[PDB]
Amino acid sequence: FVPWFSKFXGRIL
Numbered sequence: 259f260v261p262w263f264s265k266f267x268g269r270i271l
Contacts, residue, residue, distance in 0.1 A: 260266070
């Protein structure tokens with residue numbers, strides 16, 4: 259869900 263989720267939850271793991 260969401261493009262900014264690749265920075266907010268997809269950028270860590």
